[PDB]
Amino acid sequence: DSVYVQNPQIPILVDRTDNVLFRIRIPDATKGDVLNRLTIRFGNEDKLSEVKAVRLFYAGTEAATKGRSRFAPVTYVSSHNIRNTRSANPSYSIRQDEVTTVANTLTLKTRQPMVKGINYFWVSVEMDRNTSLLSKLTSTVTEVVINDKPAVIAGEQAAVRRMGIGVRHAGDDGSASFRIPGLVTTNKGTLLGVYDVRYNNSVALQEHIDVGLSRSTDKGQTWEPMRIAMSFGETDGLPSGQNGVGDPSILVDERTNTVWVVAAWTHGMGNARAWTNSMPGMTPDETAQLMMVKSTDDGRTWSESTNITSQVKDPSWCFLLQGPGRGITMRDGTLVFPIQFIDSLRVPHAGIMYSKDRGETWHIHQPARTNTTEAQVAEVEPGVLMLNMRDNRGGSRAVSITRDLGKSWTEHSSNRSALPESICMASLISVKAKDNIIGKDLLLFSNPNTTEGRHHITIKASLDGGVTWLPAHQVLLDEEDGWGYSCLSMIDRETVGIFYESSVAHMTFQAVKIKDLIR
Amino acid sequence: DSVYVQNPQIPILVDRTDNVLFRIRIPDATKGDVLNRLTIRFGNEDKLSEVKAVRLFYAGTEAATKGRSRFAPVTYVSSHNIRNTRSANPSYSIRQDEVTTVANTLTLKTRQPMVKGINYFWVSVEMDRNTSLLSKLTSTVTEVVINDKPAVIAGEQAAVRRMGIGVRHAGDDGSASFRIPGLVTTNKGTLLGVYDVRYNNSVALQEHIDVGLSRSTDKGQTWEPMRIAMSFGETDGLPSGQNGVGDPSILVDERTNTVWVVAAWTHGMGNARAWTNSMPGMTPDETAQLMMVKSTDDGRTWSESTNITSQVKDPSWCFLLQGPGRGITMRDGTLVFPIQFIDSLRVPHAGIMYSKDRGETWHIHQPARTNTTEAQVAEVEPGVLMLNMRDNRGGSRAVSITRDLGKSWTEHSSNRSALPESICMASLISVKAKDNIIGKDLLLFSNPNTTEGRHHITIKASLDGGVTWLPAHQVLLDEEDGWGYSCLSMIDRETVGIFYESSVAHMTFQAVKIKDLIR
Numbered sequence A, B: 001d002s003v004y005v006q007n008p009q010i011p012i013l014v015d016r017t018d019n020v021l022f023r024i025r026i027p028d029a030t031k032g033d034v035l036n037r038l039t040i041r042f043g044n045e046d047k048l049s050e051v052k053a054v055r056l057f058y059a060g061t062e063a064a065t066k067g068r069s070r071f072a073p074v075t076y077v078s079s080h081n082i083r084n085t086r087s088a089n090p091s092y093s094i095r096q097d098e099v100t101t102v103a104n105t106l107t108l109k110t111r112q113p114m115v116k117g118i119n120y121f122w123v124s125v126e127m128d129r130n131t132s133l134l135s136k137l138t139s140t141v142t143e144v145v146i147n148d149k150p151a152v153i154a155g156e157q158a159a160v161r162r163m164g165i166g167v168r169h170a171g172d173d174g175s176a177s178f179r180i181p182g183l184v185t186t187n188k189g190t191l192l193g194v195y196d197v198r199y200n201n202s203v204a205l206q207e208h209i210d211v212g213l214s215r216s217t218d219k220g221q222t223w224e225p226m227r228i229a230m231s232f233g234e235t236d237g238l239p240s241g242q243n244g245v246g247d248p249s250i251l252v253d254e255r256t257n258t259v260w261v262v263a264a265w266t267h268g269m270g271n272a273r274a275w276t277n278s279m280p281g282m283t284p285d286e287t288a289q290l291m292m293v294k295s296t297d298d299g300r301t302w303s304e305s306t307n308i309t310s311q312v313k314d315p316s317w318c319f320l321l322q323g324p325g326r327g328i329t330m331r332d333g334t335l336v337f338p339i340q341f342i343d344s345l346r347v348p349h350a351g352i353m354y355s356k357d358r359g360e361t362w363h364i365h366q367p368a369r370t371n372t373t374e375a376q377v378a379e380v381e382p383g384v385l386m387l388n389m390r391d392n393r394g395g396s397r398a399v400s401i402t403r404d405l406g407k408s409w410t411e412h413s414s415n416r417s418a419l420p421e422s423i424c425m426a427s428l429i430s431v432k433a434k435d436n437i438i439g440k441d442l443l444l445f446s447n448p449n450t451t452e453g454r455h456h457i458t459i460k461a462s463l464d465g466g467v468t469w470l471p472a473h474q475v476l477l478d479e480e481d482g483w484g485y486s487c488l489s490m491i492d493r494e495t496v497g498i499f500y501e502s503s504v505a506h507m508t509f510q511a512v513k514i515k516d517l518i519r
Ligand SMILES: CC(=O)N[C@@H]1[C@@H]([C@H](O)[C@H](O)CO)O[C@@](OC[C@H]2O[C@@H](O[C@H]([C@H](O)[C@@H](O)C=O)[C@H](O)CO)[C@H](O)[C@@H](O)[C@H]2O)(C(=O)O)C[C@@H]1O
Pocket: A179, A180, A202, A203, A204, A205, A247, A273, A274, A275, A373, A374, A424, A454, A483
């Protein structure tokens, strides 16, 4: 009979006990058939001394109504189960074999009698906790033996597998979930990742939500314990569940290395979504408040929050907040945070908010585009800001240019064409020629590369200021289902970091060589 | 202004830290208004020595879009949060005052400045863990002072509150949820309650599900630690997630005091629902299997499972299983378990399965009615079996009679008329005249007393063999939302037990005097 193999392009987490290397479907088994041996081969230059162990699991059969093309009956390693996100659910997968000394050829064994029809097995890889985030595996199933006969192998399994690290898992420090990533590199090379700490569940404001921060001084190989960057606990004697703060955006003031976090504080509003329940006005009791904290010590400690609402919110707006992810420093020292507001008629608009005085005062001019929400901004050329926007019309990112900090806007050539989306947050950054190994100005963009669902998390690079995104200049990181938000920061001259919601952890960090993007 | 009070008809659990006694809405507060004190009065005959503590909580305000007639913005005490089902979520409710020695008059205070518009407070009652299940509280909010003026109190708050006990809470013994209650009284007066232990989540078979059992030798004041009555773990080397057993039904063989549990074992079927994925055949690999265990020691220990599929399942049926809840012993010693089968055309039918030989052999004859599922059976008069059925047409219970153990069936006068339902499991039992204090044959019925959703869990009594269910002969136990399944058993001559899925715990036990049903 014929055997099918999948090598899923998902991150192998260095901090996990189990990671799916291969999924295998045996579609047409006779009752009693036994998978005696499976052989995997790794590429000659793979660093197999970083592989702690490889495992073969059996996961039984398929439901009668689910057809014959799936590679599994269920998620093998959960990213949501607060009681276990790090190993295979033992109730879905039974270990058959384990090898703890991994060579270029590897054989795994089973004595499990198969059921009639579909049978599922899969290969777990466990990595050394100190595995280089830049390391890659090129693994293939080369032989599968059933009843002492080699079987015909089919399936696309030629993926070059990448490493990652689960910075936050569901359930960490008692929190149900973590959402809405932001990432910057400080002037010291320190990585700062921000996110919602969603304690009770995974719904947005209003709820019990604080802004968490994870700090790495070693390019993401290690992360310090979670800091609360921003929190309103029981302000004015209202429950913490009616005092949430979230959808954070973080920037480094590149002139001072002062780090800024802006977030939306909801005060009251029962247990309902702020998106529909934030109302016109200015006071905390009336409307969502635009709040900021700062760190003068490379993200170790955080100021008390300052309320910036009165400086920038039109009273008639239902809701003003930051675009989640990150802000920028411009070449002339202006600090810029993307923003979004819901007007009196409940129409959302993306725009920008800027400070020319090191974050003392903030200003908003004109919206970029009707019916847009979350946006990220890059200085594509000197004094020239590119706004890349989530568009409620569906299908594709909106792209506008301002050269007057949003007093006026022009559509970009790439607007509503060049970058597919499913209506989801996306990351965009600029990289100066002198600041990277290619020696050319780059734009780097990340989002779920699809018009439906949130999957195929992809980094794209542009060499012509975001006019063109050539297919060759793209790295697929995560082809499976997630919440889809992502944020990019250059780690060093050679490597871009991505902090994102993945199929494998709520907050996932990966590092990618620029030379893999632009060959 | 004007203040609104709710006294919700939900069980006060003796094992909980918090129970909602009163919910209060202050609809039209001015910013800064303060609830200086509210006074509660308890009835003259209340056993206040059993009240451990009373608490006043503030829960903030309401969402602008959610209207002005709710009594809360959120569930105050969760029945689903595996991390806490026993106390108020501290993120939704802030304690204002607390009294730990309770008199007939009681004053609670706050210094919380209210927000403009809607403000929510509520009163928690905590009972001594040894509080009598038969105790009742008659409590009223008699005074509410705001800015040192008495306010006008409105609302229905005259409810006579009853006690109950949370036998199983979400998260107990590591299990995500508990569902599908069954209850019997052994010849020794011992209460035996069965249920699905749904480890991973709350979905039906197929999943990692065992049959749990809780035992009480003191009329439900105490429950012995959970026993696994039936389990298939990793049978044939298939995951425990593809070896679930559930939807249990329990009966006591009144002649021998041998206790029987029947359940559906699903083997394989991926991670999909057995209702649509169980297929024709006879083997465990082919179709859901009918399994039975027994206890000869009053439910302390349980036999290994016997497979009775071959005796009673037509090969062409997609799915044969017990009707969840309980079976009976007839006056002539016949053991009867309600059953249901899905035929070759996917049409479900309710019927009965019986043993005349102490459970050695089982027989099924003819279905009672097309497009029915879960049913419970009672011997309403000698040799006369009433089958009460969940009906997919909606709105009302189907009721049929057999005098020949299901060879033939007659429609009852009460069919599709007398008993409202929303398509949900219901409990029906018979009580002999000599076996209860009323000295008359009773039928007792429990279900969610509604045509939409699952709420208003109500015990109903009939004096005329289920022809008439007079409104006067009904007790409302739970007016809030739950999963709706229930099972009745007489505890003694004077009191009926109900083991049910409630708004306050996955498995809830309450005891009700017959004299409260029939006055
Ligand atoms: C302040 C604010 O509301 N926050 C942001 C919202 C924002 O509402 C929109 O940009 C406005 O148009 O976008 C996000 O959440 C809102 C959506 O959540 C959906 O449910 C899940 C759920 O986010 C997840 O957490 C499971 O629990 C997802 O669809 C994931 O696929 C709901 O269908 C809607 O409420 C839907 O509006 C988003 O993810 O897009 C996250 C962000 O915080």
